[PDB]
Please model this.
Amino acid sequence: KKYDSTGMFHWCAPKEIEKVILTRSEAAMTVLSGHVVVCIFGDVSSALIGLRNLVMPLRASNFHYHELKHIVFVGSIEYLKREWETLHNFPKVSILPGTPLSRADLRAVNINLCDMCVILSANQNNIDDTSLQ
Amino acid sequence: TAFAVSVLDSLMSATYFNDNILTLIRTLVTGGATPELEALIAEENALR
Amino acid sequence: GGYSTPQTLANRDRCRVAQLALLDGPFADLGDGGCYGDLFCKALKTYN
Model:
């Protein structure tokens, strides 16, 4: 089993959340070149940004397996554990607990060698005043 | 025997007239935080 | 998931969007040619 039922998207065996979690050193030993780094600003009480719709177009069937871009989600694990139920069926996906404002975490995932860095926020809707926007 | 943050406001005006006063106060109070230490703290939010 | 089927493998065939560069490769001669239409026609005729 490599693709989905329609054979139009990539697929993988259900991976446990604890397997894909990487620490700063663990991300340091592995080589992340030409990958995608997604920065998530959210917590347990935030709203769900549908990260599935972010990863589905990237790993389609028209791309080769070696051509797939390793997607690393740098953000709080408290929010990310609520979204792993829709992401575990995708390959080459890793999660790094931390904050996007920490330069150590950014250096861990080799932020300098990435094709694109995505910065997203989830708790912005809850806040109302323009200053905190 | 008492200390309040309300006595530190007078720093700002002084800091405008000469930043050397603030630099001396910092290097005398915090224990000598060199700018290299400041950069290292700003990098990893810890001490190595 | 799904198993290997010729229908799925046929479904795999699509057009992917990407971004090529004019510095080196077969289009380097047209990098400063000043005819974007000629480059488009050549790319469509040769590599579709």
